[PDB]
Amino acid sequence: AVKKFKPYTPSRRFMTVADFSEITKTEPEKSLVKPLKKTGGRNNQGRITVRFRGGGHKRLYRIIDFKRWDKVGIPAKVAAIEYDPNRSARIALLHYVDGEKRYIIAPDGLQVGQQVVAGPDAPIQVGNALPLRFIPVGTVVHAVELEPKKGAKLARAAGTSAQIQGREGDYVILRLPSGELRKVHGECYATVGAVGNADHKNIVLGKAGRSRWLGRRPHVRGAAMNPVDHPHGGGEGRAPRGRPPASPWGWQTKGLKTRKRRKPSSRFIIARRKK
Amino acid sequence: MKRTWQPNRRKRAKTHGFRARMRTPGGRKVLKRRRQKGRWRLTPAVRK
RNA sequence: GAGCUAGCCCUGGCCAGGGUGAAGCUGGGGUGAGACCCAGUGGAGGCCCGAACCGGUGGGGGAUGCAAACCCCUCGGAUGA
RNA sequence: GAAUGCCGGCAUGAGUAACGAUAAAGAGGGUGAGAAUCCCUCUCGCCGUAAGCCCAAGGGUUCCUACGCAAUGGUCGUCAGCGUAGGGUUAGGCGGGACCUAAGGUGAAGCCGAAAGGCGUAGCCGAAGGGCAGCCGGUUAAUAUUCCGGCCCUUCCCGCAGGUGCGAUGGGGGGACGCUCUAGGCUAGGGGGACCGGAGCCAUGGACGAGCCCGGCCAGAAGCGCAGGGUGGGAGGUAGGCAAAUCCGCCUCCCAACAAGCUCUGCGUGGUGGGGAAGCCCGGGUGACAACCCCCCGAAGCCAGGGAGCCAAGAAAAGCCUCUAAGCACAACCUGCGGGAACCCGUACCGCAAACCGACACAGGUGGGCGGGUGCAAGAGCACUCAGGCGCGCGGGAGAACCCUCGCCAAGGAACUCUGCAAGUUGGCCCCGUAACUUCGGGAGAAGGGGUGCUCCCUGGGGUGAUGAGCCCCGGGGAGCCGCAGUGAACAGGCUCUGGCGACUGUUUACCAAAAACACAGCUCUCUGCGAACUCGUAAGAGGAGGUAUAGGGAGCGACGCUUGCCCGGUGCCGGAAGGUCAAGGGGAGGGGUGCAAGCCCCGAACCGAAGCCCCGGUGAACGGCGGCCGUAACUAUAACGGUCCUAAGGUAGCGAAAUUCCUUGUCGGGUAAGUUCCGACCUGCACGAAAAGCGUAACGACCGGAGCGCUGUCUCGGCGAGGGACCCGGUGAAAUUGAACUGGCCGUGAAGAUGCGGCCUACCCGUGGCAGGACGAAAAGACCCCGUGGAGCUUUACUGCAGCC
RNA sequence: CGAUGUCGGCUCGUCGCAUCCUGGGGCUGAAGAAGGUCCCAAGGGUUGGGCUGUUCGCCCAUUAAAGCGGCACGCGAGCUG
RNA sequence: UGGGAGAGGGUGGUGGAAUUCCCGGAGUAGCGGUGAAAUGCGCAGAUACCGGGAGGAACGCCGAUGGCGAAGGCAGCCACCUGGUCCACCCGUGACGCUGAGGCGCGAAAGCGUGGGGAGCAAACCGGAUUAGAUACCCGGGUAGUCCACGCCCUAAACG
RNA sequence: CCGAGGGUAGGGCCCGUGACUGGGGCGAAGUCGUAACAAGGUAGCUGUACCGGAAGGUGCGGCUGGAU
RNA sequence: GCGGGGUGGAGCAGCCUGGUAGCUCGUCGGGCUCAUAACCCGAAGGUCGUCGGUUCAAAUCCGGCCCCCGCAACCA
Numbered sequence A: 001a002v003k004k005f006k007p008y009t010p011s012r013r014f015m016t017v018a019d020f021s022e023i024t025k026t027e028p029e030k031s032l033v034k035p036l037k038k039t040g041g042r043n044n045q046g047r048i049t050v051r052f053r054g055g056g057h058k059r060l061y062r063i064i065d066f067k068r069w070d071k072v073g074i075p076a077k078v079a080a081i082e083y084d085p086n087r088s089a090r091i092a093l094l095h096y097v098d099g100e101k102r103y104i105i106a107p108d109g110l111q112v113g114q115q116v117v118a119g120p121d122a123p124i125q126v127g128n129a130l131p132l133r134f135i136p137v138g139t140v141v142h143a144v145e146l147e148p149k150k151g152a153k154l155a156r157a158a159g160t161s162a163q164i165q166g167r168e169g170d171y172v173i174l175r176l177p178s179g180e181l182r183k184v185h186g187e188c189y190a191t192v193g194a195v196g197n198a199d200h201k202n203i204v205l206g207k208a209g210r211s212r213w214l215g216r217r218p219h220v221r222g223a224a225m226n227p228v229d230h231p232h233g234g235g236e237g238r239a240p241r242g243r244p245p246a247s248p249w250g251w252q253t254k255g256l257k258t259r260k261r262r263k264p265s266s267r268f269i270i271a272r273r274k275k
Numbered sequence B: 001m002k003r004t005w006q007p008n009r010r011k012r013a014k015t016h017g018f019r020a021r022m023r024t025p026g027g028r029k030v031l032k033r034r035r036q037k038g039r040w041r042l043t044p045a046v047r048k
Numbered sequence C: 001g002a003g004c005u006a007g008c009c010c011u012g013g014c015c016a017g018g019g020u021g022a023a024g025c026u027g028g029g030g031u032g033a034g035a036c037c038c039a040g041u042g043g044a045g046g047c048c049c050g051a052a053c054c055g056g057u058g059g060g061g062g063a064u065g066c067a068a069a070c071c072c073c074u075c076g077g078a079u080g081a
Numbered sequence D: 001g002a003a004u005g006c007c008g009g010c011a012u013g014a015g016u017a018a019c020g021a022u023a024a025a026g027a028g029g030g031u032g033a034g035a036a037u038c039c040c041u042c043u044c045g046c047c048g049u050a051a052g053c054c055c056a057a058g059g060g061u062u063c064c065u066a067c068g069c070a071a072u073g074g075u076c077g078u079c080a081g082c083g084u085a086g087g088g089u090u091a092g093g094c095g096g097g098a099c100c101u102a103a104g105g106u107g108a109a110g111c112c113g114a115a116a117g118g119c120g121u122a123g124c125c126g127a128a129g130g131g132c133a134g135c136c137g138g139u140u141a142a143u144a145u146u147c148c149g150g151c152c153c154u155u156c157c158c159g160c161a162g163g164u165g166c167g168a169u170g171g172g173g174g175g176a177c178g179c180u181c182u183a184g185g186c187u188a189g190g191g192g193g194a195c196c197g198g199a200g201c202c203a204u205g206g207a208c209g210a211g212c213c214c215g216g217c218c219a220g221a222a223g224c225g226c227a228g229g230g231u232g233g234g235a236g237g238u239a240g241g242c243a244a245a246u247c248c249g250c251c252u253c254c255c256a257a258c259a260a261g262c263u264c265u266g267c268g269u270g271g272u273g274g275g276g277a278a279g280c281c282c283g284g285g286u287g288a289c290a291a292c293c294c295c296c297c298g299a300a301g302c303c304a305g306g307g308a309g310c311c312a313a314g315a316a317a318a319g320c321c322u323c324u325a326a327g328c329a330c331a332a333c334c335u336g337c338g339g340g341a342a343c344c345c346g347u348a349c350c351g352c353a354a355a356c357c358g359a360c361a362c363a364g365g366u367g368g369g370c371g372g373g374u375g376c377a378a379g380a381g382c383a384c385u386c387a388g389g390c391g392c393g394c395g396g397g398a399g400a401a402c403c404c405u406c407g408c409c410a411a412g413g414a415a416c417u418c419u420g421c422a423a424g425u426u427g428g429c430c431c432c433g434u435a436a437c438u439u440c441g442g443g444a445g446a447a448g449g450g451g452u453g454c455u456c457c458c459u460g461g462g463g464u465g466a467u468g469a470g471c472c473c474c475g476g477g478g479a480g481c482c483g484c485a486g487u488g489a490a491c492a493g494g495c496u497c498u499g500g501c502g503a504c505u506g507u508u509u510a511c512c513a514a515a516a517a518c519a520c521a522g523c524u525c526u527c528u529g530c531g532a533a534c535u536c537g538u539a540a541g542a543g544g545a546g547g548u549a550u551a552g553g554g555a556g557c558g559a560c561g562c563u564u565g566c567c568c569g570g571u572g573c574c575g576g577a578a579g580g581u582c583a584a585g586g587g588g589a590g591g592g593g594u595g596c597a598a599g600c601c602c603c604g605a606a607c608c609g610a611a612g613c614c615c616c617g618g619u620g621a622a623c624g625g626c627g628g629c630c631g632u633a634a635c636u637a638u639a640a641c642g643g644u645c646c647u648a649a650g651g652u653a654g655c656g657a658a659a660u661u662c663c664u665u666g667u668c669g670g671g672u673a674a675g676u677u678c679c680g681a682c683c684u685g686c687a688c689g690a691a692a693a694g695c696g697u698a699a700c701g702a703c704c705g706g707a708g709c710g711c712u713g714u715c716u717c718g719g720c721g722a723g724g725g726a727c728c729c730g731g732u733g734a735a736a737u738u739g740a741a742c743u744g745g746c747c748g749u750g751a752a753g754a755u756g757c758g759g760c761c762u763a764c765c766c767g768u769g770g771c772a773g774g775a776c777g778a779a780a781a782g783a784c785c786c787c788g789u790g791g792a793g794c795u796u797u798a799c800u801g802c803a804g805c806c
Numbered sequence E: 001c002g003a004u005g006u007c008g009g010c011u012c013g014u015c016g017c018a019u020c021c022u023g024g025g026g027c028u029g030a031a032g033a034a035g036g037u038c039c040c041a042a043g044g045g046u047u048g049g050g051c052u053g054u055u056c057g058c059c060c061a062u063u064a065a066a067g068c069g070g071c072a073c074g075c076g077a078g079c080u081g
Numbered sequence F: 001u002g003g004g005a006g007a008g009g010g011u012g013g014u015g016g017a018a019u020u021c022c023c024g025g026a027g028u029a030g031c032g033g034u035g036a037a038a039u040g041c042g043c044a045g046a047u048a049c050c051g052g053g054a055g056g057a058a059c060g061c062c063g064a065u066g067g068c069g070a071a072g073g074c075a076g077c078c079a080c081c082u083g084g085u086c087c088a089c090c091c092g093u094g095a096c097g098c099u100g101a102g103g104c105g106c107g108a109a110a111g112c113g114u115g116g117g118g119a120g121c122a123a124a125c126c127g128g129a130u131u132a133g134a135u136a137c138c139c140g141g142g143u144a145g146u147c148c149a150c151g152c153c154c155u156a157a158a159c160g
Numbered sequence G: 001c002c003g004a005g006g007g008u009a010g011g012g013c014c015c016g017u018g019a020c021u022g023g024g025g026c027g028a029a030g031u032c033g034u035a036a037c038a039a040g041g042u043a044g045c046u047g048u049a050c051c052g053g054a055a056g057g058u059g060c061g062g063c064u065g066g067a068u
Numbered sequence H: 001g002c003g004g005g006g007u008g009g010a011g012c013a014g015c016c017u018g019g020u021a022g023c024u025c026g027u028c029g030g031g032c033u034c035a036u037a038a039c040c041c042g043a044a045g046g047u048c049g050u051c052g053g054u055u056c057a058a059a060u061c062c063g064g065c066c067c068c069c070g071c072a073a074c075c076a
């Protein structure tokens, strides 16, 4: 449950911070961090390819175990639940009875000291990682693989979920967090439950600077630029778009679809997204 | 006020140095150029 | 050609002194339990005054200058984007 | 002979401006041919969070000594960062290398690209980050953690002794980390002493004093003491750490448990080695056998990898420790001890500056450390001062205008002016006191007001120490004295009422615009299912992201509050497996050429044939658009209401002479003696209006309006004073400009504004200080404007291509 | 057009007279006072404020009066902006 | 103390009918709607029918004139937790009571804030009709809302 | 010392008045519709919401003070 | 300056493309009603702004004058 401040500065008015309650270990597992190369949006040519990126807090990257089928049948205890700044979710530390330590995405309702397990024979409880084709129809799930053994790719952001609508051959039918209806291979792994930290969407950054700490540099409207800069540049005084609303590079931004036509994924998208 | 020339031995020899000229086709041609002309120094002197 | 400048990356460094007094915590009151109230404690903040530092608002001077942007007075920020 | 021609030389302005911070000078003695300028002394002034000192970069001999003075030095010059010559920089321990990684760079494997080349895991390179062993003094003209003296320490090689399953580029541990706040104990540094040492002093009225002046330390191995850091011990099992592993991780068990122990640092002491003032007498010597003690203040530095809180969640790798594998255990490693070995480069000097970046010995710029004392509430603020460094490389006079900086001004008090522009006022502290409004934080230092020095008396709490004295830190009460005046100097808000715009702190046109512009949290639309979209690239590859719809791209709007109406006919976009059109290709009714002929070859209808477009729907926080005429109420006026034409639909709420209103200083009200501005209304809104958002809004603003109080040289209206120039004399000595000049007024004339023509009037020759009307004065081959079938940036339903996408 | 800086204010004036005032006049539907109208006259004078960039104008309060024009809409190598 | 009846309340779970959409089938010239129509939908294959899937909301018969609660109000079914109440016995305390300005709490619908959810319904709005007009009643659509959670609002022909 | 009062600054309350603006009351024969009383020709009233020249309309829930 | 308009009483067609004036309302007479509105059945009313030309013929085509809307009026 997010946390408010009294308005003792103009920014403290609306600024809200996470409650951090479910966090039980305030420092990462040194055997599982590694240097996160900050890119600032530059690519290997040294060119800004993603504008307005840079200057945020330094981070170490907690390694996440998006496979989990490395250790079929090896249960593990929940050591702690920590802070990961590289993602919107919380991470949970796993002390495998194997003696191995790994991080996973912390689901909602996961409790320190509980034990979870991965594999075809796993129980259907919050935290267990099973192949999609074995989870009862209708149950929520997260950390879903798109293709078998290729890694968990779907529903990993705080609060997201995915419900198994039904099965069809070697494929089960998922409702993604987007509302899209997709066939995913049954052998693909997923984790029972929804990612925790649901309250992540109600955080009110509160002031410019907070955006800057997140690595997010100020954004300039094409309307504020000049014709050499952006389709919306120029004009004496303010100005409506005066043309179909577009991006700096020409293409239109209000409705223009961009998914690739002949993409082979189309054969498994059952219903495009919603709301 | 800060003027444009702020000398720096390391910057000078890494930017304009012999080995900088030699690793690039443009740079080699610079040295070829300056040899052809008879330049005493093919390269800006910097005290290392 | 990025030894000026603009942005970013890596790694270091710097910010006198004073002021205000958020959450929390303690104690008390309150109540079925609470909410909450008070005092103490606490020391938060793109908080306040003000040097360094970063600036460049107003005026004057300068104008073959001390200077191809300077000087004086005044003024803005000064734990933060 | 002219090209604002090119080169060079020499003029003109002119003995003119200037000679570079207004920190400031004077005399005496020396030296030398020559002295305001060099040396010495005494006096004066200036900096002192520097204008002193030590590093780094940059500079590259500028360092020291001798001898020089042509040039350099804005004057001089005997001097010098100048010329000549000689000398000067010494390290296992300081810095860098023979160590380690960071971004980045390079790059066996690999990938890509017409060539050149671009990528790329490892590895390598890469530092002001990690890691690693020297501290105090003396010494030279010039080097010193480098030479020397003292007391310490490191690595490598080898030997000896003891110990041990030894052994690594391989596994594990460690290294290893933010921000703010901060405990204890220290140290750096400082204040004081009636105590210790000291040459000396008694002045001019007094003082022979518990007087004055000056000093009262630094380094140090082991050990010891103090304060901290780090750290469980043992056993059993084990499938994890890509082989093994007794290590590590996991599990069970026992003991230990704020401890202690072991270990590592800091500080203190510590054998011992140094230092040692004023004053005097020539850098020295004496002082002196110097003394080297007590007390208080005390870090931001040390213990340190300390603690707490917070969210934005805070490098890597080696050294190091441990585990084992090959192997090897005649080895090897560990510990102690000894001897031997220990290379390369830097070291001078300036270093907020005359030696660096600015063409200059240039009022500019330049990162780190030290930065003493007293008082002012604190402090790196301010004033004055220590150490130390300086008086700014032209001077002497004079005492006009005028200019700059500064001081005061009778009466008035903004009447000045576009504007209180500027300059006043206010000004720190402590106390009393403080409004509308509000988002309850704020508005607030609101506003306004009192106090503030010194002396004596009584007294409360605190740190130290001991619970006491002493020192030190906070106070409280009483009685008094002095002046015009007690933050007596310096530094240090003027305030209020009321609009516009923007929520706010932020950002911007380096060098005429800081703002109402950009940004901004927040709101909405939209794209994107992950080999994501999007971006950059021919590509490979990268960013996005080691992220996954609570995410990422794009767009508008811009805290918050209350809200955001109608129009989908046109354009964009989304949907639409019918139809229509539709290229290459398919197909081949039927034509043509040629050949004796089989043949070879050419054209070619129907029909099948994608996207796009057509067509059918949707869609506004998509591009956008949101009427006209005529009539009508029992005074008049006006129209709730009605008639009709047109549209895709006819502007809703809210606002309105507005950052928008043309007519316009609209009309009415307020404010004023008077108000083209202001505020408040009205509504015929030339030409508001709802996310190019509409109406509000506390707080905020070096933004832009209006008004009042305070107070002023802004003004009536000017006067006087200060210093730096201007002026005079000695030194040095420019500049733009310049057809030549023997260069007057008027009224005419003239290419229409004449020193230069005509007529007339005036006028002896040449300077100096001043003023700026003319020389269509100087500067700049007009930016305005036109012209050129000149150029460039930008646009689009101009043309034609191309990338890209379909 | 190988540059003649452009409104207004300020400062400093100077000129014209088609005279705002003061002086001298005729005519008057001039009783007086005070006006009207025209002639002569350029010696001197010709205020301070509110509003606006303003010139102009309107307004306040006075005046003998609150004149009109020229001088590159006089005067930016004099200032302002 | 032993008993009973009940949609009293809160939480979690869950059943079937129906509506809408989507998919498949089969099938064709209309469907829909009204007072009568038109808008609308349908040869780009609707309506009607069978099978499949998705989702939301309300719970038919039981249901009654019934029951429960202080009121507002509560209706599929299951389990947990919790209030009230009536009856019996005649067991304990011994007037410990009634009321209640204030205070505090609950409080239908609509409405507000932040998230979610969205089948049917439907203010607003659009269209078709009617009409002199029709900013209505009727018809085709249709956004909030209706639904969940949390926090507000505190109203009523909150009535017997 | 106190002290009538005078003065300076800032508050609170009341009253009078004000361009314009809000609805209200009343006013013999104004304009527009017909909302309610009959089932008033869509039962009405109601709280709330939104909307419209106006009465009103509509949604959501409620009351009978509704008819047959 | 450039564009559009002017026609029964009101608002609109006809103009282009000559021969013809048409739609809604209103107005007049009749009907239904106790009466009015609405509704129903009939009717009248326009020499086309004005003048001048072209034509056999002009609302129409071309000039002039009149009125009435709309747009423009910029560079210093």
Ligand SMILES: [Mg+2]
Pocket: A003, A004, A005, A006, A012, A013, A014, A015, A016
């Ligand atoms: Mg808050």
Ligand SMILES: [Mg+2]
Pocket: A018, A019, A020, A021, A022, A023, A090, A197
């Ligand atoms: Mg949490």
Ligand SMILES: [Mg+2]
Pocket: A030
């Ligand atoms: Mg690591």
Ligand SMILES: [Mg+2]
Pocket: A037, A038, A039
């Ligand atoms: Mg990267």
Ligand SMILES: [Mg+2]
Pocket: A044, A045
């Ligand atoms: Mg790269």
Ligand SMILES: [Mg+2]
Pocket: A045
């Ligand atoms: Mg590159």
Ligand SMILES: [Mg+2]
Pocket: A045
């Ligand atoms: Mg490049």
Ligand SMILES: [Mg+2]
Pocket: A049, A050, A051, D535
């Ligand atoms: Mg981008």
Ligand SMILES: [Mg+2]
Pocket: A040, A041, A042, A048, A049, A050, A051, A052, A053, A054
């Ligand atoms: Mg970027």
Ligand SMILES: [Mg+2]
Pocket: A082, A083, A084, A085, A087, A088, A089, A090, A091
């Ligand atoms: Mg996290």
Ligand SMILES: [Mg+2]
Pocket: A086, A087, A088, D547, D551
């Ligand atoms: Mg993320």
Ligand SMILES: [Mg+2]
Pocket: A146, A147, A148, A183, A184, A185
């Ligand atoms: Mg699959």
Ligand SMILES: [Mg+2]
Pocket: A201, A202, A203, A204, A205
């Ligand atoms: Mg949010």
Ligand SMILES: [Mg+2]
Pocket: A056, A057, A058, A059, A213, A214, A215
């Ligand atoms: Mg960040």
Ligand SMILES: [Mg+2]
Pocket: A219, A220, A221
């Ligand atoms: Mg922006």
Ligand SMILES: [Mg+2]
Pocket: A222, A223, A224, A225, A226, A232, A233, A234, A235
């Ligand atoms: Mg722009």
